[PDB]
Symmetry: D2
Subunit: 141 residues, 4 copies
């Protein structure tokens, strides 16, 4: 199963060629993880306003098919790895309208849970609530 974040491609996201500028696909990963916390871990987003941080470690995208203005894109997110203070997510970018479902792109991202201090940013274990939520989207065999 995957977490489905819906996006409708806007004109400001299209380059003079007619297709979606590459960097936008990375913004959509951020939206997908944010919308996830809104829906399934609202205590966590919330804490972000009082201490906590989800730091991006790395991100990746691969681009297969051209998107266009007014395409309805699904950013489908799955859990790759949960190890201590770190979270590994993968993404699928499927155009669901107009026309047939088309895999436009695939992405990945790594996030570390941190907090702030005088000594510096310290690694702090994934909040219970977010662990509980992420688990539902793990890939089994």
């Amino acid at each position: 199963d995957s977490y489905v974040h819906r996006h409708v491609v806007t004109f400001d996201e299209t380059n003079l060629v007619g297709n979606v500028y590459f960097a936008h696909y990375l913004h959509w990963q951020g939206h997908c993880r944010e919308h996830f916390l809104a829906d399934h871990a609202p205590g966590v987003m919330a804490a972000l306003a009082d201490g906590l941080a989800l730091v991006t470690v790395d991100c990746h995208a691969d681009f297969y098919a051209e998107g266009s203005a007014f395409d309805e894109v699904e950013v489908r997110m799955m859990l790759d790895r949960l190890d201590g203070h770190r979270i590994a997510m993968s993404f699928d970018y499927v155009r669901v309208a107009p026309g047939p479902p088309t895999l436009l792109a695939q992405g990945r991202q790594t996030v570390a849970c941190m907090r702030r201090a005088g000594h510096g940013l310290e690694p702090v274990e994934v909040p219970a609530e977010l662990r509980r939520a992420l688990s539902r989207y793990a890939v089994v065999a």
Copy 2:
């Protein structure tokens, strides 16, 4: 006199038509004012990290001519008004390369000086240093 902030139009700023998306001209006003504080009021820029916030009250733009990817744009900024806690700026967007200088658009913006309160915000008086800098225009 005007403060000149240089911008080179990038592909992410151009839509399917081939011209600069309107919204971007408003971002550039932001870059121009920020670049101005870096150059002419650097104490104020440090003070925005601790207490002080510049809030946007309004902004306006009028569009005359189309930009294109790789155009060298001058965002030329002037001081209209200094009104207690408030600052009014205007803008000229001139393409200086390629081809002849062309006025693409003109703009305006209002910014208020605010120092964060118990739970909200309050109007402070334009910082001494920022007043000294707007005086040389």
Copy 3:
């Protein structure tokens, strides 16, 4: 009555202060007029791919209240005037969640309808369907 475009504020739209960076509110006007065409004038939408362009003449925004990441904003659009080849829209940005509904900001925009005819951009009138739809 007004046309409703829903937007949920994302973190990339917030600056270090904590509130929505001003320039994002102009993009939403763009999303609102585009979303309007998808819903209520899908022929015009298609005509854009071939000749027809909606050129922005001017835009304006006034900012009253601070937005925050995860706020559910309504960009409510109304028709001010329809003048030959031109269209004047206004906008209300209302936070509908969380908490009480709050007017964050007001907006306006003027758009000129334009299809090419020679070595240059030429004023064509408002398409029948778009003239019909703005009236609603």
Copy 4:
């Protein structure tokens, strides 16, 4: 040796944490490769308007240190691979001001040289002028 694109971090690039939003680092790769064409392959720049595109195959970024508004970042670009119709670049994002040069992130990107015939993207061999310009930034041992 590397191609140096300079970027000054603006407020619209910073989130409520105070640091640069991750996705902006991908936009800067775009600016770097574009600025490179302007400087060292201006014929390729002109051919873009008429029937040449550079389609992004993939991109990647790793993040090591936090940027801040007004930091002067160098987006330094090197040529990894030139393989027929393809180009692989790597990127070092170095803060040069304020304080000691600091590696903030590292990125990679793959481009493909594509031309339109009717309504079909065909792979075109890397143009002579860009092939020669990129070559000056190749890795020496």
